[PDB]
Amino acid sequence: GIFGAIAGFIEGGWTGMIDGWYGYHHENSQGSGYAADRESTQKAIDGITNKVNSIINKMNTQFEAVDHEFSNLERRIGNLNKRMEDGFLDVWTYNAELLVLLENERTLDLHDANVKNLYEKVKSQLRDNANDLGNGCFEFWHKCDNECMESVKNGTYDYPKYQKESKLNRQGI
Amino acid sequence: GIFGAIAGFIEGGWTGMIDGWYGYHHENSQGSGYAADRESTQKAIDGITNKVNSIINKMNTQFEAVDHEFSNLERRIGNLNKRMEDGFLDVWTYNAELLVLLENERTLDLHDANVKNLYEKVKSQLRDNANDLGNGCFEFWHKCDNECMESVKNGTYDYPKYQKESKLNRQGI
Amino acid sequence: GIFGAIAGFIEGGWTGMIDGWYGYHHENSQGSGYAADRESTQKAIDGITNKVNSIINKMNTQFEAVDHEFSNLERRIGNLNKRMEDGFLDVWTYNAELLVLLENERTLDLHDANVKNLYEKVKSQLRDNANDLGNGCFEFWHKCDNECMESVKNGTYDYPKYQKESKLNRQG
Amino acid sequence: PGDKICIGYHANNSTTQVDTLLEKNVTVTHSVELLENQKEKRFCKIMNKAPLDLKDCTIEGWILGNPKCDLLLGDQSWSYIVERPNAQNGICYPGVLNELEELKAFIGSGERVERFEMFPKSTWAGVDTSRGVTNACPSYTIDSSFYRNLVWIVKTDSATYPVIKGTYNNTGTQPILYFWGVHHPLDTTVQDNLYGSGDKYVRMGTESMNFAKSPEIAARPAVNGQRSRIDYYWSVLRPGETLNVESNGNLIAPWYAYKFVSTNKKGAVFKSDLPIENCDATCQTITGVLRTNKTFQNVSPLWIGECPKYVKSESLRLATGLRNVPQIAT
Amino acid sequence: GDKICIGYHANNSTTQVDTLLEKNVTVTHSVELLENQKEKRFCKIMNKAPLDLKDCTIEGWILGNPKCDLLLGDQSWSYIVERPNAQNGICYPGVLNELEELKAFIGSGERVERFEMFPKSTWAGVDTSRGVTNACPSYTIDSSFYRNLVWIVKTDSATYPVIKGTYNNTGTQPILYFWGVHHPLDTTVQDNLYGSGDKYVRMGTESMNFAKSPEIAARPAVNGQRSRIDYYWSVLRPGETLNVESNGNLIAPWYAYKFVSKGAVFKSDLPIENCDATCQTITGVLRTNKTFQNVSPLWIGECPKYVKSESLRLATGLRNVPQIAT
Amino acid sequence: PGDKICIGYHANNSTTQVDTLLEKNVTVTHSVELLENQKEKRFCKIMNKAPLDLKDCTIEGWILGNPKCDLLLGDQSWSYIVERPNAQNGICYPGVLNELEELKAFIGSGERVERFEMFPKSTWAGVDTSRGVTNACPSYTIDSSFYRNLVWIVKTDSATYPVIKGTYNNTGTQPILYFWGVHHPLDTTVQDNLYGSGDKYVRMGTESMNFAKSPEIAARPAVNGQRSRIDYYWSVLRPGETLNVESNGNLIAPWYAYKFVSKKGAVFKSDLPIENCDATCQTITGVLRTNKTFQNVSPLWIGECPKYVKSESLRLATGLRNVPQ
Ligand SMILES: *[C@@H]1O[C@H](CO)[C@@H](O)[C@H](O)[C@H]1NC(C)=O
Ligand SMILES: *[C@@H]1O[C@H](CO)[C@@H](O)[C@H](O)[C@H]1NC(C)=O
Ligand SMILES: *[C@@H]1O[C@H](CO)[C@@H](O)[C@H](O)[C@H]1NC(C)=O
Ligand SMILES: *[C@@H]1O[C@H](CO)[C@@H](O)[C@H](O)[C@H]1NC(C)=O
Ligand SMILES: *[C@@H]1O[C@H](CO)[C@@H](O)[C@H](O)[C@H]1NC(C)=O
Ligand SMILES: *[C@@H]1O[C@H](CO)[C@@H](O)[C@H](O)[C@H]1NC(C)=O
Ligand SMILES: OC[C@H]1O[C@@H](O)[C@H](O)[C@@H](O)[C@H]1O
């Protein structure tokens, strides 16, 4: 994908993460499960919704075709009407079709960017207190219980707090 | 931000940096301040000015409506003329309004990317010789000169030169 | 560029790498050379090819001008026809020229993105068994064999296998 | 063995695909179809107003008052008009309704007409009214009749056909739509029989309009058993205008005419055989009712009311969610 | 320790743009591409004044209604302004045939020069001095006629003979000219004014023919007249010749215009002022460098593109997130 | 000293440039030009079918049967018409061809006509059909001739000009394009000489068409020596329709007419040569033989052509930005 995360360095999606577009999956002694990152998901929803409503808005005028009859001495203006109406029909078909293809590419990139950013956000809190497995997963060099998991998700993870423990484990292995 | 920097992992802008779009804020024993990166600022100004002129250029044709009268036996061609003029008006109104919404989105992204890439240019140079605070700030583990600040900005930062001082500080703590 | 790699932290292109868009340069005791990344190059070709064909396909209708004649009592509809045809001519000229400018900007960013993500693919394999220079280049902390270089390009690079050797020289 | 946290994205059982500039047939977790392709194949009431069903009568047969179109006779109010493709009852006495396309356009304009006697038969002096009837214009009851809105005037038993005059002064607030005609015999014999001898004319005028026509006598190919023709004409008498009718002979005279209410609505005439039913609609196309929220439609370019924009597309599906990459179950 | 931080510009700006993704986003810098302002007047275009028809319509001017004498003669215009309340047009009731086509041809010109096409002496044996009507007063004479036409009548004793006239256009310029055909209300006026019997007006050039005879009938009174005139116009091409022939009911061409040819005809009440413009719309002057305007689709000169938008503001700067100061 | 692996991108010898919204003149490794600006300056066959070259005749000269357009006389099949600008042979006897622009439009949109005798000279009884000739319409071999498709009917040596009548019933499946006229003498002397005395008329009618006209005598400016005029008319007799003709003078009678068979039709007014070539796309200024999507040559064409735009070039980047060392 262009930011390289979705179907990228993160191979597949989660059917188990049912309450959001982007999320965390966690495992610890306490348990395992899925949680959406609410803030990034709600911002994407607002953005996508604005995009859809903008497009609907801008597309909210209509060319008017008409039922007028023409006589056998009105071939030129009859054809003028015909090429005129077809003319606008072709321009609007083009605009709608090209717009959907283009916006569909950019909408997928946006999602790919939000996943990538969510991953970079976690990565930089954790520093070397965790080990990169591949596939967007980090293995902690220390015990990370539920409160510690939440602080990663919240953006308040305490790297100094677990540094000494992480360093001792990183050595013995 | 789609690249996540602006109003993102860098929470706010600087009213104090007045001579560029994108910049460095430094603090050291010799003082502190805000200095724009001239090259990335100028490239963006050239790019954005070109986009405005291209749009202005591509919009430099007019459709011209006309004052023609029609008689009471000319309802059909009179209405042909009205629908045509209205049709071209609706098409150009659509093109201009959709273009503005789309290019504003992409312009803000461009700025976001230019900030994100300055931030990465510094982070790769510094490696573990500096500590990542939040908000796009780095704290050096060594003493960073005005001359050293310049070397980070212009891309010639000497990592070997401070690696020992930095390591002893990094973990003398 | 917008992803910062092309004409960015990777300052130049490689005239040497003939067989692909994006790829690898290696130096080692056995020599130095170039190799395209087949997978990302083909995936780009596929994407770009589809974009060109979508554009051609969507531009596949023509407005038809006619050269009907108009009499000296038909100045109004004669003029109507002219404005009508010049009006569609102007819209399609606008549609084609703007699409080309926009799409050109986006295709350059796509290439930039692909180079960037290849750089990050390698970086993530190598971890601290190598040093990331400013420029898209990694200097190994170990001896990297032609086999070793191939495994980096394959995505089958073996980090634990070289961790200890890399730790040592990193300490020298 | 150790505690994991992983960053990822949603997937689901969606099989719906979109296209993008770079790739076709991309399955995505969420999307919106912007284009409507469904319709109800019928005509309904627009703004709670029923359309006029012309049934077995064409628009001509209707407003001239073809004798077989009595079902439509009188007042009519409509949101749009529906004319069946094989209606039989139009112009029954052969001839041209002049400026027909512009008449059809003007009638499409209206939301309502009121029938009323414009020129009483007594208006014309020294001529015979009650013989103005033909076999090419039967009603359903009588074999020889004539349009309900025109008098075919004939000279009385005296060889002379006198000059006749008629005036109508539109003291109303509504324009009046009215019709007349000029008869063209196949014969100088028939010409003599029905009208006087010598040069005949039909002249008419208002403050802003003139008309002058004389007979053009010749045998034309038979139609409805007639080798003669009638030239039919229509016009609109503005509020405050006066009409003067003057004729030597060959006048088919206005008898009834319509007060005409022009419409705020765009107006339409649909040529179609679809049913009219007791239903309501917001969007009525010529091939059906669209009952929809969508932005685009592929049903028809021709419509009255509030419809989505017409395009040729088969589908316009916008991605809203992301690339759907669910785990393989096995 | 020592910091280096990466960041971006902020400012006092409260100006916003819309985005496909977001509405009301404040940005540090931006450009409005649309012009919504207008001087409510008519100005010179290309240092050339417009023609103000004042109290006359285009018909009153170009036929020479006697109350339009201020307009009489040569005119050069950059565009025409016809006032919507103008009372002086066709004074003697009747149709100006192909009126809309005439108005469009006049709109396509920039100059006319008035000149006598057919001197009254053209038509032998008829009375060219008696053709006046109470339906066309000047401001001083209660009975006058169009300055560009002669209403010919039979001399004091009958009969009205065949009259003929030719004009050869040896000039480089097209000639716009007019004529008419009188339709008396009754036979009595037909016989008084003209001879007894069938009457014709016939005209022809190398490329055009015309033939018409009187349609005698009483129409509703208009300016006291139950009769009518059918007016006509044509363009005599350079190198063309016009033959005129009639035995009665001819409203003859007298004066005509050498015509010099996208101008415009503005129906408006705006004042014309001693001002100069590059761009003129029907509702005013645009003095601007903007790319788009919502003022009008109808204009003359070099005007930006007309759109229905209220604002078309292009972000050039980045999103504005200035520090909160308390 | 250490071994290295570097990520990077293709570069090449290309000097080809593209424009983008942000930057002009960007050299790029690979690109595709979508616009065609080149043409063959000739006319070619289209659906393996030749065009009609009207040579020295206008459309009017041809279908009326101007005596010097005999080389065109008869049946024709065409993929499009070429009318040469300086063509001299059209309406030879001065007069107006009524509804000309609408006739020209009906003709283009045809693909073929078959000429046939609609009304034999024997159709009209009591009149001379052999004298209807003028010096304004010479052939190449006689000074005084007339349109091949019309008969200028005139009085028998012994007066007068009776009522003449003719009918034709279109029994075929094809519409019939036909012509007639009304003579307008400059004098009552020529009127009396050619036709009788008395009020003359020309009346025609079908199931859906009415025509009536009377002579309009007057001297018009001299053209090809003629101060008289003919008003010319055309019509189309639908399959199943009957035409009735009736006149007691001034009738220029239909003689030959056309079975007319009706895609996109084209009348190209040009002086370009018609050569022995084949093509898919023909414009008024020449052949496009191209796979490109856009063209800047002409808005007027027949066949399958690219879309016309005013652009000088439409080059899509396909490759990345070219930055060689
Ligand atoms: C970059 O920084 C170094 C260190 O201050 C300085 O010596 C050099 O001149 C600067 N390089 C430039 C401006 O190119
Ligand atoms: C991949 O790399 C290995 C060395 O790690 C090599 O032996 C093998 O042939 C390569 N195979 C592929 C995927 O081409
Ligand atoms: C989309 O892909 C499907 C197969 O996955 C194919 O049947 C279809 O043709 C493609 N595009 C269309 C027609 O929407
Ligand atoms: C028609 O009626 C109105 C209203 O009384 C009257 O003013 C007008 O004079 C009438 N028309 C004429 C010309 O008599
Ligand atoms: C570049 O090199 C190729 C390879 O031989 C050659 O064919 C081509 O003409 C050269 N092109 C340019 C732009 O010099
Ligand atoms: C024309 O011919 C057909 C069949 O030959 C005949 O049925 C029809 O009545 C004819 N039409 C006229 C009006 O003569
Ligand atoms: O009313 C006159 C008519 O009478 C009918 O019977 C006859 O078929 C018609 O041809 C016509 O003559």
PDB file of N, CA and C in Angstrom, chain C residues 7 10 12-14 17 20-21 23-27 56 61-62 65 69 90 93 97 101 104-105 111 136-140 143-144, chain F residues 2-11 19-21 30 101 104 269 293-294 299 301 305 307 310-311 315-319 323:
ATOM      1  N   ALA C   7      15.675  12.143  -4.746  1.00  0.00           N
ATOM      2  CA  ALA C   7      16.232  13.506  -4.737  1.00  0.00           C
ATOM      3  C   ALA C   7      16.186  14.115  -3.339  1.00  0.00           C
ATOM      4  N   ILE C  10      18.350  10.148  -0.391  1.00  0.00           N
ATOM      5  CA  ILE C  10      19.085   9.396  -1.417  1.00  0.00           C
ATOM      6  C   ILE C  10      19.260  10.339  -2.588  1.00  0.00           C
ATOM      7  N   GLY C  12      20.927  10.811  -5.390  1.00  0.00           N
ATOM      8  CA  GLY C  12      20.958  10.568  -6.814  1.00  0.00           C
ATOM      9  C   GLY C  12      20.362   9.239  -7.184  1.00  0.00           C
ATOM     10  N   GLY C  13      20.141   9.043  -8.481  1.00  0.00           N
ATOM     11  CA  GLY C  13      19.712   7.753  -8.981  1.00  0.00           C
ATOM     12  C   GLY C  13      20.913   6.943  -9.444  1.00  0.00           C
ATOM     13  N   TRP C  14      20.661   5.694  -9.828  1.00  0.00           N
ATOM     14  CA  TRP C  14      21.706   4.814 -10.329  1.00  0.00           C
ATOM     15  C   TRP C  14      21.575   4.494 -11.817  1.00  0.00           C
ATOM     16  N   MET C  17      21.804   0.618 -12.354  1.00  0.00           N
ATOM     17  CA  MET C  17      20.721  -0.348 -12.157  1.00  0.00           C
ATOM     18  C   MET C  17      19.715  -0.297 -13.321  1.00  0.00           C
ATOM     19  N   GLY C  20      15.450  -2.432 -13.356  1.00  0.00           N
ATOM     20  CA  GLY C  20      14.329  -2.155 -12.480  1.00  0.00           C
ATOM     21  C   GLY C  20      14.220  -0.689 -12.122  1.00  0.00           C
ATOM     22  N   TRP C  21      13.073  -0.302 -11.564  1.00  0.00           N
ATOM     23  CA  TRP C  21      12.890   1.046 -11.003  1.00  0.00           C
ATOM     24  C   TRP C  21      13.595   1.329  -9.668  1.00  0.00           C
ATOM     25  N   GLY C  23      15.844  -0.633  -6.185  1.00  0.00           N
ATOM     26  CA  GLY C  23      16.752  -1.743  -5.982  1.00  0.00           C
ATOM     27  C   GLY C  23      17.906  -1.513  -5.036  1.00  0.00           C
ATOM     28  N   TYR C  24      18.907  -2.384  -5.146  1.00  0.00           N
ATOM     29  CA  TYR C  24      20.022  -2.422  -4.201  1.00  0.00           C
ATOM     30  C   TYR C  24      21.424  -2.275  -4.815  1.00  0.00           C
ATOM     31  N   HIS C  25      22.277  -1.515  -4.137  1.00  0.00           N
ATOM     32  CA  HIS C  25      23.706  -1.471  -4.436  1.00  0.00           C
ATOM     33  C   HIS C  25      24.501  -2.069  -3.253  1.00  0.00           C
ATOM     34  N   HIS C  26      25.424  -2.977  -3.542  1.00  0.00           N
ATOM     35  CA  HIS C  26      26.204  -3.577  -2.464  1.00  0.00           C
ATOM     36  C   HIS C  26      27.674  -3.462  -2.774  1.00  0.00           C
ATOM     37  N   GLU C  27      28.497  -3.246  -1.753  1.00  0.00           N
ATOM     38  CA  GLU C  27      29.935  -3.442  -1.897  1.00  0.00           C
ATOM     39  C   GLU C  27      30.439  -4.538  -0.941  1.00  0.00           C
ATOM     40  N   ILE C  56      -6.841   6.528 -20.163  1.00  0.00           N
ATOM     41  CA  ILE C  56      -7.176   6.353 -21.557  1.00  0.00           C
ATOM     42  C   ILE C  56      -8.647   5.925 -21.708  1.00  0.00           C
ATOM     43  N   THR C  61     -14.388   8.939 -24.908  1.00  0.00           N
ATOM     44  CA  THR C  61     -15.554   9.482 -25.574  1.00  0.00           C
ATOM     45  C   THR C  61     -15.083  10.744 -26.262  1.00  0.00           C
ATOM     46  N   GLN C  62     -15.745  11.094 -27.355  1.00  0.00           N
ATOM     47  CA  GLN C  62     -15.409  12.304 -28.082  1.00  0.00           C
ATOM     48  C   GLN C  62     -16.639  13.188 -28.199  1.00  0.00           C
ATOM     49  N   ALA C  65     -17.945  17.683 -33.150  1.00  0.00           N
ATOM     50  CA  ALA C  65     -18.206  18.917 -33.858  1.00  0.00           C
ATOM     51  C   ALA C  65     -18.804  18.605 -35.219  1.00  0.00           C
ATOM     52  N   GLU C  69     -24.109  24.226 -41.972  1.00  0.00           N
ATOM     53  CA  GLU C  69     -24.117  25.614 -42.441  1.00  0.00           C
ATOM     54  C   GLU C  69     -25.290  26.378 -41.838  1.00  0.00           C
ATOM     55  N   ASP C  90     -13.223  23.582 -24.540  1.00  0.00           N
ATOM     56  CA  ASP C  90     -12.524  24.150 -23.389  1.00  0.00           C
ATOM     57  C   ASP C  90     -12.543  23.269 -22.112  1.00  0.00           C
ATOM     58  N   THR C  93     -10.261  20.178 -22.718  1.00  0.00           N
ATOM     59  CA  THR C  93      -8.878  20.634 -22.734  1.00  0.00           C
ATOM     60  C   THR C  93      -8.422  20.885 -21.292  1.00  0.00           C
ATOM     61  N   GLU C  97      -5.601  18.552 -19.368  1.00  0.00           N
ATOM     62  CA  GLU C  97      -4.349  19.183 -18.948  1.00  0.00           C
ATOM     63  C   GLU C  97      -4.164  19.147 -17.419  1.00  0.00           C
ATOM     64  N   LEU C 101      -1.207  17.117 -15.099  1.00  0.00           N
ATOM     65  CA  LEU C 101      -0.381  17.795 -14.096  1.00  0.00           C
ATOM     66  C   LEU C 101      -0.478  17.135 -12.717  1.00  0.00           C
ATOM     67  N   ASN C 104       0.819  13.411 -12.760  1.00  0.00           N
ATOM     68  CA  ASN C 104       2.272  13.416 -12.805  1.00  0.00           C
ATOM     69  C   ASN C 104       2.863  13.659 -11.420  1.00  0.00           C
ATOM     70  N   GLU C 105       2.281  14.602 -10.680  1.00  0.00           N
ATOM     71  CA  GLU C 105       2.740  14.866  -9.321  1.00  0.00           C
ATOM     72  C   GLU C 105       2.557  13.641  -8.428  1.00  0.00           C
ATOM     73  N   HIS C 111       6.492   6.606  -6.698  1.00  0.00           N
ATOM     74  CA  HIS C 111       7.868   6.151  -6.807  1.00  0.00           C
ATOM     75  C   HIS C 111       8.683   6.500  -5.559  1.00  0.00           C
ATOM     76  N   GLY C 136      20.486   6.200   2.587  1.00  0.00           N
ATOM     77  CA  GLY C 136      19.921   4.964   2.062  1.00  0.00           C
ATOM     78  C   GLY C 136      20.862   3.763   2.180  1.00  0.00           C
ATOM     79  N   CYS C 137      22.063   3.994   2.721  1.00  0.00           N
ATOM     80  CA  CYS C 137      23.112   2.979   2.811  1.00  0.00           C
ATOM     81  C   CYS C 137      23.299   2.462   4.233  1.00  0.00           C
ATOM     82  N   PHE C 138      23.600   1.170   4.334  1.00  0.00           N
ATOM     83  CA  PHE C 138      23.881   0.488   5.592  1.00  0.00           C
ATOM     84  C   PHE C 138      25.281  -0.123   5.581  1.00  0.00           C
ATOM     85  N   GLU C 139      26.103   0.242   6.562  1.00  0.00           N
ATOM     86  CA  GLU C 139      27.438  -0.329   6.685  1.00  0.00           C
ATOM     87  C   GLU C 139      27.391  -1.460   7.707  1.00  0.00           C
ATOM     88  N   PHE C 140      27.632  -2.692   7.271  1.00  0.00           N
ATOM     89  CA  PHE C 140      27.515  -3.868   8.142  1.00  0.00           C
ATOM     90  C   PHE C 140      28.555  -3.896   9.256  1.00  0.00           C
ATOM     91  N   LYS C 143      31.039  -9.316   8.398  1.00  0.00           N
ATOM     92  CA  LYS C 143      31.255  -9.663   6.995  1.00  0.00           C
ATOM     93  C   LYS C 143      30.001 -10.179   6.306  1.00  0.00           C
ATOM     94  N   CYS C 144      29.608  -9.489   5.234  1.00  0.00           N
ATOM     95  CA  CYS C 144      28.415  -9.895   4.512  1.00  0.00           C
ATOM     96  C   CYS C 144      28.821 -10.452   3.150  1.00  0.00           C
TER      97      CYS C 144
ATOM     98  N   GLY F   2      33.764  -1.339   6.179  1.00  0.00           N
ATOM     99  CA  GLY F   2      32.736  -2.366   6.219  1.00  0.00           C
ATOM    100  C   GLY F   2      32.016  -2.578   4.893  1.00  0.00           C
ATOM    101  N   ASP F   3      31.489  -3.780   4.713  1.00  0.00           N
ATOM    102  CA  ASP F   3      30.569  -4.069   3.639  1.00  0.00           C
ATOM    103  C   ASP F   3      29.310  -3.196   3.735  1.00  0.00           C
ATOM    104  N   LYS F   4      28.708  -2.901   2.581  1.00  0.00           N
ATOM    105  CA  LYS F   4      27.546  -2.011   2.494  1.00  0.00           C
ATOM    106  C   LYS F   4      26.455  -2.594   1.603  1.00  0.00           C
ATOM    107  N   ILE F   5      25.202  -2.346   1.966  1.00  0.00           N
ATOM    108  CA  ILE F   5      24.105  -2.479   1.016  1.00  0.00           C
ATOM    109  C   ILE F   5      23.310  -1.158   1.053  1.00  0.00           C
ATOM    110  N   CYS F   6      22.933  -0.699  -0.131  1.00  0.00           N
ATOM    111  CA  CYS F   6      22.337   0.609  -0.329  1.00  0.00           C
ATOM    112  C   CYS F   6      21.011   0.452  -1.061  1.00  0.00           C
ATOM    113  N   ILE F   7      19.992   1.200  -0.651  1.00  0.00           N
ATOM    114  CA  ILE F   7      18.746   1.209  -1.410  1.00  0.00           C
ATOM    115  C   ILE F   7      18.768   2.445  -2.291  1.00  0.00           C
ATOM    116  N   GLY F   8      18.212   2.330  -3.507  1.00  0.00           N
ATOM    117  CA  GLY F   8      18.308   3.372  -4.515  1.00  0.00           C
ATOM    118  C   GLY F   8      17.318   3.191  -5.663  1.00  0.00           C
ATOM    119  N   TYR F   9      17.459   4.016  -6.690  1.00  0.00           N
ATOM    120  CA  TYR F   9      16.481   4.067  -7.765  1.00  0.00           C
ATOM    121  C   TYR F   9      17.087   4.227  -9.156  1.00  0.00           C
ATOM    122  N   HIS F  10      16.332   3.827 -10.171  1.00  0.00           N
ATOM    123  CA  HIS F  10      16.788   3.869 -11.558  1.00  0.00           C
ATOM    124  C   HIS F  10      17.060   5.279 -12.067  1.00  0.00           C
ATOM    125  N   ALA F  11      18.103   5.392 -12.877  1.00  0.00           N
ATOM    126  CA  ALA F  11      18.435   6.612 -13.589  1.00  0.00           C
ATOM    127  C   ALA F  11      18.808   6.237 -15.015  1.00  0.00           C
ATOM    128  N   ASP F  19       5.462  17.997 -16.904  1.00  0.00           N
ATOM    129  CA  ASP F  19       5.064  19.026 -15.948  1.00  0.00           C
ATOM    130  C   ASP F  19       4.197  18.399 -14.872  1.00  0.00           C
ATOM    131  N   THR F  20       4.262  18.958 -13.666  1.00  0.00           N
ATOM    132  CA  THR F  20       3.383  18.551 -12.582  1.00  0.00           C
ATOM    133  C   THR F  20       2.794  19.822 -12.006  1.00  0.00           C
ATOM    134  N   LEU F  21       1.824  19.681 -11.110  1.00  0.00           N
ATOM    135  CA  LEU F  21       1.248  20.836 -10.425  1.00  0.00           C
ATOM    136  C   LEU F  21       2.289  21.638  -9.653  1.00  0.00           C
ATOM    137  N   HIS F  30      10.969   7.459 -17.636  1.00  0.00           N
ATOM    138  CA  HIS F  30      10.030   6.844 -18.571  1.00  0.00           C
ATOM    139  C   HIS F  30       8.743   7.674 -18.581  1.00  0.00           C
ATOM    140  N   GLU F 101     -29.587  24.979 -46.093  1.00  0.00           N
ATOM    141  CA  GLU F 101     -28.720  24.481 -45.034  1.00  0.00           C
ATOM    142  C   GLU F 101     -29.250  23.130 -44.513  1.00  0.00           C
ATOM    143  N   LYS F 104     -28.488  20.470 -47.182  1.00  0.00           N
ATOM    144  CA  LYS F 104     -27.071  20.093 -47.123  1.00  0.00           C
ATOM    145  C   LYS F 104     -26.882  19.096 -45.940  1.00  0.00           C
ATOM    146  N   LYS F 269     -15.245  20.438 -46.578  1.00  0.00           N
ATOM    147  CA  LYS F 269     -14.943  21.482 -47.548  1.00  0.00           C
ATOM    148  C   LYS F 269     -13.448  21.722 -47.508  1.00  0.00           C
ATOM    149  N   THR F 293      -4.602   8.824 -27.520  1.00  0.00           N
ATOM    150  CA  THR F 293      -5.896   9.131 -26.914  1.00  0.00           C
ATOM    151  C   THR F 293      -6.406  10.527 -27.265  1.00  0.00           C
ATOM    152  N   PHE F 294      -5.480  11.461 -27.438  1.00  0.00           N
ATOM    153  CA  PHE F 294      -5.817  12.835 -27.783  1.00  0.00           C
ATOM    154  C   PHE F 294      -5.205  13.251 -29.124  1.00  0.00           C
ATOM    155  N   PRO F 299     -11.293  19.166 -34.706  1.00  0.00           N
ATOM    156  CA  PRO F 299     -12.600  18.789 -34.140  1.00  0.00           C
ATOM    157  C   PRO F 299     -13.578  18.176 -35.152  1.00  0.00           C
ATOM    158  N   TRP F 301     -14.249  15.363 -37.934  1.00  0.00           N
ATOM    159  CA  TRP F 301     -13.733  14.115 -38.478  1.00  0.00           C
ATOM    160  C   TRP F 301     -14.828  13.094 -38.682  1.00  0.00           C
ATOM    161  N   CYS F 305     -11.635   8.470 -34.126  1.00  0.00           N
ATOM    162  CA  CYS F 305     -10.523   9.378 -33.933  1.00  0.00           C
ATOM    163  C   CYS F 305     -10.271   9.601 -32.452  1.00  0.00           C
ATOM    164  N   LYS F 307      -9.841  12.068 -29.131  1.00  0.00           N
ATOM    165  CA  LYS F 307     -10.524  13.278 -28.656  1.00  0.00           C
ATOM    166  C   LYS F 307      -9.711  14.533 -28.979  1.00  0.00           C
ATOM    167  N   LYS F 310      -7.117  21.452 -27.319  1.00  0.00           N
ATOM    168  CA  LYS F 310      -6.251  22.532 -27.800  1.00  0.00           C
ATOM    169  C   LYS F 310      -4.796  22.353 -27.352  1.00  0.00           C
ATOM    170  N   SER F 311      -4.543  21.346 -26.522  1.00  0.00           N
ATOM    171  CA  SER F 311      -3.202  21.120 -25.981  1.00  0.00           C
ATOM    172  C   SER F 311      -2.120  20.893 -27.041  1.00  0.00           C
ATOM    173  N   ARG F 315       1.888  14.572 -21.865  1.00  0.00           N
ATOM    174  CA  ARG F 315       2.806  13.506 -21.507  1.00  0.00           C
ATOM    175  C   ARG F 315       2.669  13.106 -20.033  1.00  0.00           C
ATOM    176  N   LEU F 316       2.214  11.871 -19.820  1.00  0.00           N
ATOM    177  CA  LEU F 316       2.129  11.274 -18.489  1.00  0.00           C
ATOM    178  C   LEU F 316       3.467  10.717 -18.100  1.00  0.00           C
ATOM    179  N   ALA F 317       3.982  11.147 -16.956  1.00  0.00           N
ATOM    180  CA  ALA F 317       5.085  10.412 -16.329  1.00  0.00           C
ATOM    181  C   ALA F 317       4.657   8.976 -16.067  1.00  0.00           C
ATOM    182  N   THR F 318       5.480   8.004 -16.421  1.00  0.00           N
ATOM    183  CA  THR F 318       5.264   6.649 -15.938  1.00  0.00           C
ATOM    184  C   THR F 318       6.402   6.256 -15.005  1.00  0.00           C
ATOM    185  N   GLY F 319       7.598   6.674 -15.395  1.00  0.00           N
ATOM    186  CA  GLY F 319       8.825   6.481 -14.653  1.00  0.00           C
ATOM    187  C   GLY F 319       8.999   7.477 -13.527  1.00  0.00           C
ATOM    188  N   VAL F 323      17.507  11.314 -12.008  1.00  0.00           N
ATOM    189  CA  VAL F 323      18.628  12.016 -11.375  1.00  0.00           C
ATOM    190  C   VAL F 323      19.935  11.230 -11.530  1.00  0.00           C
TER     191      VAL F 323
END
